Amino acid sequence: IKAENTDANFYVCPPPTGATVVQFEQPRRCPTRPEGQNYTEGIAVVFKENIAPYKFKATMYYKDVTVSQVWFGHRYSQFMGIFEDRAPVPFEEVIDKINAKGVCRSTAKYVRNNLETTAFHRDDHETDMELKPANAATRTSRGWHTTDLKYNPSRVEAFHRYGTTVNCIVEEVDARSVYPYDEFVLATGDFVYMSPFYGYREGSHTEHTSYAADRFKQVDGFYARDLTTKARATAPTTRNLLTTPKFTVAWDWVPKRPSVCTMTKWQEVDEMLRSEYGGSFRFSSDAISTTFTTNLTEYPLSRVDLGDCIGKDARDAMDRIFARRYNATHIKVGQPQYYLANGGFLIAYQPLLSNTLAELYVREHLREQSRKPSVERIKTTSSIEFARLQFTYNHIQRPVNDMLGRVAIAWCELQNHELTLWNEARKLNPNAIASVTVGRRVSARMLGDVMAVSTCVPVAADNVIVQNSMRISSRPGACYSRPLVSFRYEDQGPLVEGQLGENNELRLTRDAIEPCTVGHRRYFTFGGGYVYFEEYAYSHQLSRADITTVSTFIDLNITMLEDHEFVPLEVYTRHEIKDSGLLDYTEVQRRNQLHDLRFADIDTVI
Amino acid sequence: IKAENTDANFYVCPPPTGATVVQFEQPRRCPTRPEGQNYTEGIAVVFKENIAPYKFKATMYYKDVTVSQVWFGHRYSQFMGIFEDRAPVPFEEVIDKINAKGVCRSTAKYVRNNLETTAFHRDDHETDMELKPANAATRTSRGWHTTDLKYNPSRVEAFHRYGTTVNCIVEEVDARSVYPYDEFVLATGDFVYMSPFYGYREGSHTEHTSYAADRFKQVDGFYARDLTTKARATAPTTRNLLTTPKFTVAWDWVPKRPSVCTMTKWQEVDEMLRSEYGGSFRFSSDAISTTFTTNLTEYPLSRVDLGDCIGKDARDAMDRIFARRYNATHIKVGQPQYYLANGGFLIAYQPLLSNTLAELYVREHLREQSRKPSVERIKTTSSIEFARLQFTYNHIQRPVNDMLGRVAIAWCELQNHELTLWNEARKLNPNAIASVTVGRRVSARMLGDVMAVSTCVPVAADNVIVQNSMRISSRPGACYSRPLVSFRYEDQGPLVEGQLGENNELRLTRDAIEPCTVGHRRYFTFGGGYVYFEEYAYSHQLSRADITTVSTFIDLNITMLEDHEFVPLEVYTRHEIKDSGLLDYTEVQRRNQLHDLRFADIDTVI
Amino acid sequence: IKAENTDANFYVCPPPTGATVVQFEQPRRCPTRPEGQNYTEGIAVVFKENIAPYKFKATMYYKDVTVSQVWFGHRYSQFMGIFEDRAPVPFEEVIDKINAKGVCRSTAKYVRNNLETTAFHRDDHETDMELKPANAATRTSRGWHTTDLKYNPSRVEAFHRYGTTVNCIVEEVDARSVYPYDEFVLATGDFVYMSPFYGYREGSHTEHTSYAADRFKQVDGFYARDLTTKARATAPTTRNLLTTPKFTVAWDWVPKRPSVCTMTKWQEVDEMLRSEYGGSFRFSSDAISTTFTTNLTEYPLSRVDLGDCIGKDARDAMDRIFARRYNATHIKVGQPQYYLANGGFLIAYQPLLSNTLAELYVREHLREQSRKPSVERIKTTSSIEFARLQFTYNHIQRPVNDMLGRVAIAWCELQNHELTLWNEARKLNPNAIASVTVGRRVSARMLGDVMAVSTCVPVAADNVIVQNSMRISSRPGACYSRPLVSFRYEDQGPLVEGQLGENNELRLTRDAIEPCTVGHRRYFTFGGGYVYFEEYAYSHQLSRADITTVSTFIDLNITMLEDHEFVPLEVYTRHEIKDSGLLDYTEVQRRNQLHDLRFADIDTVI
Known part of the structure; x- marks a missing residue:
């Protein structure tokens, strides 16, 4: 029967030829520590040119x-x-x-x-x-x-x-x-x-x-x-x-097709913190958790194409940021400010100030815009608490920026942690890694330390038809790895033979076998549900929300008996060992690597 | 044998033998993109349908x-x-x-x-x-x-x-x-x-x-x-x-044993927003991260049994949520609402309202109660602030709902990361993964894409005895892999032979051999402590505080032990290379697979 | 070419042996949410004896x-x-x-x-x-x-x-x-x-x-x-x-080399809670993720050697904590108090009070220092409200403690979420585990159930040369899999043969060959960028300043090149399946066993 579990359209998985310009960048050192690097909060929008993939x-x-x-x-x-x-x-x-x-x-x-x-x-x-x-x-x-x-x-x-x-x-x-x-x-x-x-x-x-x-x-x-x-x-x-x-x-053939206005924003990040440190503007984003450590000076409209288009872009961006979250949360500080990370990373940065110490607008205005590139007649400033609350500003600068450094290094370790996690993730299933990171159906594979990127031929959850013949016996009794399926692009699509892959993957494999272990009782992700075969024959399907139809519930104390029948034998059936006998998939590998150790010994006298 | 530190009982690896086939929810689809849906917040309580194993x-x-x-x-x-x-x-x-x-x-x-x-x-x-x-x-x-x-x-x-x-x-x-x-x-x-x-x-x-x-x-x-x-x-x-x-x-043989409260309170989620969208409402839970796209109407207490006990359980759950977080935090908004998430999730939902412009009580609940299933003179209303506050209601609801949507996007991406993570996690160790996700101490195994369950017996160490010398003598040179144990199900039980699995696991079979790795020194978790075999010979246990669990005065990064030459097989032998040195399980596999390349079964003239 | 992508210094792969000094602990069952309580909010300062190893x-x-x-x-x-x-x-x-x-x-x-x-x-x-x-x-x-x-x-x-x-x-x-x-x-x-x-x-x-x-x-x-x-x-x-x-x-040889002052602050933990429970104090930190079950009394200066330096250090830690967060955040109550998290973890404490009922200081410091080791005159507490509020304080205690417990359990999962995974992380990456917990160093490995470390490697991080010989002919024409590299310990050190593992790593081995995947185009992590060989011939490096990673602007969701026939191809050419895919990578690993799973005997006359 054609597929019916329409709650998830299938994935075609042919080996892709990646590029790949998208890889996990190597994790980073954790950022700067104590006080003033004039840690400055503000919304930046970071850009690059359009790469025009014609x-x-x-x-x-x-x-x-x-x-x-x-x-x-x-x-x-x-x-x-x-x-x-x-x-x-x-x-x-x-x-x-x-x-x-x-x-x-x-x-x-x-x-x-x-x-x-x-x-x-x-x-x-x-x-x-x-x-x-x-x-x-x-x-x-x-x-x-x-x-x-x-x-x-x-x-x-x-x-x-x-x-x-x-x-x-x-x-x-x-x-x-x-x-x-x-x-x-x-x-x-x-x-x-x-x-x-x-x-x-x-x-x-x-x-x-x-x-x-x-x-x-x-x-x-x-x-x-x-x-x-x-x-x-x-x-x-x-x-x-x-x-x-x-x-x-x-x-x-088509005309050259150039790209304007090519400058395309990486990201808008309001949590954009300035550290004037190491002879460098250290921009920390906790939204993407990166410190671009760039030059002090600004980046002009002249070193880009039509800096006015990006001016519009970033003005609207920062408006969306503030008006949505900060109608009465912060105060705009100076202008957006443009910084080049090598490789063309453009930082347009409208600094912001927290409403703490609301007495310092025109004054902290100047003090922190300072980094863009007896007898007496009282003559104190019209409220010397201008200067007084400036000294309090410096005071606060100390713990506020200390806290910023601490939480920023927290962010650093968090993201550096998960980076390698995702490395191992694409080791597992880079198809899924893409189907999340770009979020779309895709054909992927791990090319050593780089990935392979593509998109596959579409198959919804109605074009595929599991086979019930689940073995090859020319090599006596070799049951195939994952459900043999005859499928098709569309109803006019070519009904072609392959094997199901994990989570609706459609690999063309039709020789992908492994021994027929008795005791075969396997679900397989079938569309928006699961196929289930018992001992290499088709038992039945089950929708996702139809097997007990709940998520994290239960006790869950289920018992069982011991070494059992289903008996290919000389003693104590072996085919369940041929079903990874404890073992421990990883220990399955760790033991089968003990078999190489014998490929001799018909060739010696002592 | 009982160790110096044994608080972890010993869960002696009986893999499931047959049943069961417990199912596992797929990663829930991650959310959509721009705004308005009513997004009306409040407590939800999902009941499950009383299912129970006799x-x-x-x-x-x-x-x-x-x-x-x-x-x-x-x-x-x-x-x-x-x-x-x-x-x-x-x-x-x-x-x-x-x-x-x-x-x-x-x-x-x-x-x-x-x-x-x-x-x-x-x-x-x-x-x-x-x-x-x-x-x-x-x-x-x-x-x-x-x-x-x-x-x-x-x-x-x-x-x-x-x-x-x-x-x-x-x-x-x-x-x-x-x-x-x-x-x-x-x-x-x-x-x-x-x-x-x-x-x-x-x-x-x-x-x-x-x-x-x-x-x-x-x-x-x-x-x-x-x-x-x-x-x-x-x-x-x-x-x-x-x-x-x-x-x-x-x-x-037993009489018919049914039970009477057909719905069983399975979950509670205070983060319950109605996303008024898609010809439907979507009950969005930012506590267990769901969005059930259920119809506008509600499942009646009639079409399930005991429409009173269930309702009381839900009322108590909701009172608990309020008192625990909202004695004066939110507004009692309308009645709860009792929807069928298909497959049988019961969603009883008492809406809420933040004190954001708290001057809309009698109306706004009224308003959102829209969603349960010549000569002239001046006459102003009693407080047109009604209509003003409703204008503001709509206009702030819009970005508020957007913020909810985006925090929910974060919710979904995180949970879906973690799901795939757990997949390979249980493929590595389904015992640990399951046993902790459930709390019970159980033994699981891979039925393709789901698990099989069997509960392990927490035993004391003294029942289990790791022998001192471990090796296979089939051909000289193979010292067994995992600690061979003479154990006991009962206190005076049969000391039966198996191998200690990782961390109180006990792989019941004894065929796991490894290089008698000249320089082999390995610990294995023994209760709350660790057993030592130097070259497959027992020295001693050590507590986890003696093997120096996480430190800070160290890391600070003082140097540690290292390794040098030994005297089999000039510069140091292969016995350690085959001890999974480095290796790097990934490196282990990528090399050892080359034994097809290390296989020459052909001796012919050319 | 010598190592020139040295935005990341390079590290040769030594054989590690460990204890380990900052060691993986196991996830633990986490106790009561609501009950025996009066959680003690306030700082703790954990000391651990610096041994100062010679x-x-x-x-x-x-x-x-x-x-x-x-x-x-x-x-x-x-x-x-x-x-x-x-x-x-x-x-x-x-x-x-x-x-x-x-x-x-x-x-x-x-x-x-x-x-x-x-x-x-x-x-x-x-x-x-x-x-x-x-x-x-x-x-x-x-x-x-x-x-x-x-x-x-x-x-x-x-x-x-x-x-x-x-x-x-x-x-x-x-x-x-x-x-x-x-x-x-x-x-x-x-x-x-x-x-x-x-x-x-x-x-x-x-x-x-x-x-x-x-x-x-x-x-x-x-x-x-x-x-x-x-x-x-x-x-x-x-x-x-x-x-x-x-x-x-x-x-x-040197004199004794004493180690005063031995006991040294492990950490200073702001958030610290005492559940007086199970006949014990249970010290909980969702600030550093721990739950000890420690002694009730105070470990004096006497029961350990030289406990005064500790007291000074703890005074310092506590005042720093206050100043860094609590100028106007909580109320100081009680002394610092010692607690033995057994195994040698000292816990000084300075309890706090939330500003909930800010009126009950004099009363509450008594009420919870209770747990360290007719003509009538209206005779009440100074204000009967104190006796009034003491009432709700109790009725505050548990629910707060409930939440305190409740949130902790969430924390519990989070903590208990990841422990084992870190162990499995090293299974790919002692590289990463060491470059994070060690910080810049490498070379750990698994000895049974313990980790193994080596931190000494001096490397000419500029002198690392991927060989332009990409084959072995012992097995006639076997392309080497991992980058072979001539390197050296010092700038003039001997360029010696090894193999470039991932991320600045040079294993001393050179045996890792493979069947030459026609169309081979591979990066390998080479310090400040990647190395690239095209069909087993050096293409070029690329530093990491110019090659993309997951982001927003122009998608960056598109398909890339697809695989097709090449000219080793009758059906299913080996050289290209070498690239870890048919598949279902895990099934790649599985079929890697399929080879012994079809042959070990050649002939037998039935």
């Missing part, structure tokens, strides 16, 4: 060619070679054989390091073949292939003999560049360092390049050939064809 | 058979069969051979392939065998076995030759029905699907039936032979005997 | 010997032995061959099998050898060794054939006796008793000995020859020598 679509053009140095001995066959290589599809195969025809020859005539080389299909000659959707062309902006074969050259022994195979790959994919637009990403796992807007039109070819004009072939008037149709489409596209050393990329 | 005792009965279809070669032999099957011990063997005799024949007689096959013991015929303790326990009325090994027939080659072995299995258990009492969980590992009050008397035919009338023999007034004494130690018991298709249950 | 230098002396009992049969050669030992260099060879010469014979004369055996070099007679400094000439005090030499006995088959080799080792290192000074711990991973102040003079003889005076060799005016140069150094020094059973220690 999006479009392109298509990849190459031909993977493989040769098998089969080793024909006496009666035996060593594959002394099965070598495969991507080889850039020529402009001509695109224009005619693909764009006009939609096919690719069973021979590939390709470049390889200044040497033109040909490859054929099965010790025989050329044949155009249709680009059926590639192997693993699903789950992505599709690709198209021709076969899934390997050929063995006709048998002649006592010599390394080579059998050939040629296949085409022409693939519609999505594409992302960014300002400063001298680069772009490729939706197969590739990147090219050339300016995205480089077509010969409008002078956008005068824009950056990092390559020569011997592989860029701009067909304006091109006809976008839908590779799901292998047939042309709507009014002519300007497809640029960059014949890379491995493929060709054809893409809609 | 508890009583039962006992299980089945003979298993093992057969050896040996094929004998010339002097060699293949086991063309070692087959083990289970057979419910029928009514009569319980009544006589068990209740009257406590003994079990050496033949097991059971249907198989639709044919009743008999099995003997040792190719020799029926013989009643003592129920010998299949284990040693103190909690769920443990059971008894009869044999350990299987038999092989004489040598007759070139034809499948068969030798037989029969075993009996009789084991008492605790039994846990659950409201609404139609099926019940067991202790051995099976689940039975009959009503608990089901039987033959007091209209128990109306009780949930899902089994035929040929296996259930309600032999009541029928003595239960205490087989921990192998003797009837009871009044003649109300036993019901279901010869289930795989086993036999004999259990106390 | 830190100084020493030197280890031994000769590691090896004898190979090769097994020479027909023509083949098994090793019926490679026997490897440390023989303590005699105090004499230190005196002259090492301190006067710096040399030491190729032979060690030491007991084995209760037989004073000899060990020579290469089946020929004795010769002196030079102690060339090892890698242990750094990372502690200096150290000296010889090259990795081994000899195989002459060829005489059909008899156990024996060949010898002996290598000398002198290793000065850093040493830590800890007060109460009956002992001292070593830099090699060794402990010994017999307090190091065992010199004959100053009366230090009474200072603890655990070992007979047979091997205490006090040579005053005994310099330590610079063994990096075999030249006199360390102007003649009071060196005491213990020819331990494995080595000899030579260490500077």
